[PDB]
Amino acid sequence: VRPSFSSIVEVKIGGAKLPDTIAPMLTDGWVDQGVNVPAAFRLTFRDPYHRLLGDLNVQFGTKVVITPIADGQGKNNPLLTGEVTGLETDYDGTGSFTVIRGYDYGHRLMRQRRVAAYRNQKASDIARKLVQMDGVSVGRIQPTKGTYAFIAQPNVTDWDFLARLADENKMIMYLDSKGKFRFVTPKPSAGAPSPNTDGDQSAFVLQAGHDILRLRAAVTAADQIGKVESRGWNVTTKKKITEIAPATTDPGISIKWTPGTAAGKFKPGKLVETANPYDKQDEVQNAAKALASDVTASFSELEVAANGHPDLRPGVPVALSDVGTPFEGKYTVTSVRHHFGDGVAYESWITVSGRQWRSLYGLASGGGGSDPASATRLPSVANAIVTDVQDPLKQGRVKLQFPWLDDTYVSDWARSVQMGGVAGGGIFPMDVGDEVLVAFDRGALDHPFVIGGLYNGRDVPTKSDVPLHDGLKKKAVRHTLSDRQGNRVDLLSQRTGGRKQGVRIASGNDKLTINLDRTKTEITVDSKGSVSITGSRSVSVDAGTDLSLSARRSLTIKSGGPLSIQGGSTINMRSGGLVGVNAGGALNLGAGGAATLSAGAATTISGTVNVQINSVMTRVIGATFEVKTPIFKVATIPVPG
Template sequence: MSTNPFNTAGVQLHVLVDGVPLLEQSAMLISNITVESQLFLPSLCEIELVDSGQGVLLENGLVAGVLIEIRAISGEDIIGVPLFSGQVESIELRFDHTAGVRSVVRAYDLAHKMLHGRKTTGFPLSLYSEIVEAIGLEHGIATLAEPTEVPYTMVVQSNESDWDFIVRLAREVGYVTFISIDPAVGLPSLYWGLMAPAETAPPPVGVELSPRAIVIGDDGLISLRATVSGSGLTASASTRGWDQSLAIPAIGEGPTIGDASANVLLPVELATELGGPTAQLVSLERIAENEAATEAASVGLGFRLAGSYSNIEAIVRGNPFLMPNSAISISKAGVLTGEYTVTSSTHTFEPRSFGYRTQIMCAGYEDRTLMGLQGAAESTFKLNGVYPAIVTDVEDPEFLGRVLLSFPWLSETFVSTWARVVQQGAGEGLGMQIMPEPTDEVLVAFENGQLDSPYVLGGLYSADRLGAVPAAELIEGTTMVRAFTSREGHQLLFNDNPDDSSLTIQTTFGASCIVRLSPETGISITTIEGQPIIINSDAEVTVNSEGAVVINASEVTLSGEGAVEINGADVSITAEGAVEITTEGAITLTGSDINLASEGSVSIEADMISLVAGEINIAGGIVSLGA
């Protein structure tokens, strides 16, 4: 026989509304009180009262929004043990000819505050525990978040409620979360941390049996079903990722760690025995950003995997000490004797039938209720496919060619982490490098559908943001023109029109310099508004042509720091005006014959003229030699 006072039929559940007990005559009308509590879920309290006059709720102030408490009272203990603290969310009326009219009040603990609405926001350079503390503070809930060690570049709450978000973070690293109640003062707080170790359960020995010790055959135990299974277990778990800063894979591994210590093999030992030491579960549920993040996620995956190792379901006489995250011991259970951690509890009080009973489940990190089955599919908001975004910043602090993005269709305030930009032919020292600019619309895809890991695939045009070349010119039955235009109007134009086929390079939309290559007209270089054409070279400049080379200009100047040579089969110099040859040195004319001809006079002036030849002939109508 147990001496635990809460394993007796005399225990009752009392209701307090805003700290005040129900009226005595109203408490007599209670037909059922149910408190359901489970890791990762808000606790639910349902109170059913016989209400033939339909006035008991108003008499006691039981309306939506009021705070209620449920306490287990035994003997002379008028304070009792707190089971529930929360807020009324709904009121219901039931009727049937057997039970008559009943009023039902349904309340949820403080976690319900974090389930109202969804949002998208980012937490840059944060620890998961810091994020949870910030969310708890935002909702005015006292929070105990066990510290995590891995800082993340950006953690994104992706169109999720605050509760779903912190649950996702907890599951990823092998933590649990729920609203716990301090048994001493009855105050609720948000717990986010490791599951209570099963080995902290009290031993099933002593003068007074602990209320968290279950003994097969004890009168406090009504029924029990215990199972340990290695089905589907693997010796280790692994998550994968990609380190963008190093461009290398990130691989984490963790053992299958259980939450129970039965007199049989532990989860990792059982998995090794059944599946072999190399069997491993690889999860791609989340692609982590570096090795530290994959290691943390692998540990969390190992905890969740071990949840299938043991399953305990028990019904006992009312026991308010059996709550989620409390460690219990089971004895006289043969090979299943051991310690386990409670993951869910249902406390039911029916004063007109069996009184107060407690049902518990120890199922590790896996939710095996119908609600858990409904939510078995991945609940994280995934962005599969491609989405439009707006570039907000291109000043990458690490100079890696990344950009920041906003998603106006998703959130007015959310800005992404630094996103890599897809570049054609990208490789070490090669490929295109064309960066979008702030306010540009771009098309984005997300790694593994995760909002915290975007990639920019390319830019987009719209009715308000057209390209520099009108679409009508780009397409005339078929694609005629392909163009690339910079912000300042520098263009590369490929024109496939058979009447004007060409490749054109031009600046400022053709307002200054144009280089045009055409199979019909050749190569043309044009400048506008007085822009010069300058050719500079540290070596030779050679112009070869099988045809003529024509230079037309208002003035032509040939200058050389060394010799200037003009060679040709025939050399002809023609001028409409005078021809002047000036040199500071000698002028030498050499030829087989030299003819000087003029329709006018020929004048030679010098300080001295010397004519030397084998024979000199001077002929003329009049020849004058004198000084």
């Protein structure tokens, strides 16, 4: 029937049934099963002479199975198979008891604290991999809605990472009777029999006064809001992505009243989540749905201590009837406490609290939730080593490799801050061995950012002509901007020593240099190589007060057009053995004063032309006047004096 006449607990340790000489020694039989934390075994035997543990040879690390038997139900279907973890002995004054404590076959997930990174795997794939890796048989795994680009395990316990993953995906972290892992969606509450049933023809119906020893049901509108929004940033388009989801319905609870009424009956507020990064529409939609489920899970909180039945496993629909106006209907169980003890028969505490750990006190072993000191809430910045540069987008994006976290974690691409903008800007890409400063997006490890490279040992900067600081007043003297080899621009200012001042656009080998030197107001374009100054429509209009073009070997001046030497004063045109002027055309001279044509060797006045010597007077002072042709047209016969 619904209650029980006699109830027994059958416990098997190490695969063998409990010895007949030890079965009467058992007193308490506690089993606390939940969907948020691993279930707990507490088997308390009475050992007045302190000899039990020396006979069972029980050492933690042994398989133990606990089954309840109420009437003829529960002979098959063992309740929970797990592992003995801790031992306790209590001399409380009412009996020197020996307590064996156990955890679920799968508690090892909480035992292991891991760091890792998973690339291009679905959440169900992550669950499958982690579980097997931990030696736990896989039951049924439900594929999740969307894939993840890159997940990082930020130094957390396996159980907690998987638990949050299930929370974000609106799942349940089920661990069934035979120790099989399960990642299953919540069962709909409608499945349970109608409360209008007789209440005695099944074991999933609770009637007020029939088999409800203790009852605590609460329906509240503490933080029920109709709309919940989750927001994120899209970098491939620079878009503010957002998702608004309703919180007016809930699958786990059906009590004739919905949270939509709670939202309507008060002012229409809204809730915002600003604690996790998001990138794609799928992730934002999933987060919005998860937050809506979280908000709607607090609508009803139920806790019934009943005579029980061994079929009250977690995650099953249970109908609550004849309680009142807002408390009828169906619920989905979340935690079940099977209790055997002094003066108490087989007791079952069914607690429906959504995904919260209301059981074992809301605060539980903390402040209502774990706040580890080695969590993912990384404040400020850290240092990292670059491992990859092969960005498929050529935006300077660079992979990282944290050296204080793990030797196999290399993260994903991280955008690096650069002095650019909306319409383009300069880039200073990093090498494959730099040590760069890394910040984080809202503290999350999944989204690192690169600020710039640091300076440490074995990475001293390239040496320069002048030191970093000088002078008694001890101010900055040089402000260097440089590449990784020596192609540099220097902005230096000094009043001591060499008194170097100004700007210096140098080269790697110092062969090429543009010195804007203020110490002597001198522009020095120095080059141990070729020089080339060119224009298109006009050439350098050189000016000043002293010009000089002294180049060895050769000097060629070409015009391809009109050429002019205005001068303005004496033009001393020296030579070194030859002066030549080509027969370009009508060559003409002139002078406002004298005109002299001297030489050292034989002169001549050539030309197949009508030579002439125009003048108001002409006097050949030649020591000898020789003509080898007849002389004509002389006005008078030659006369001396």
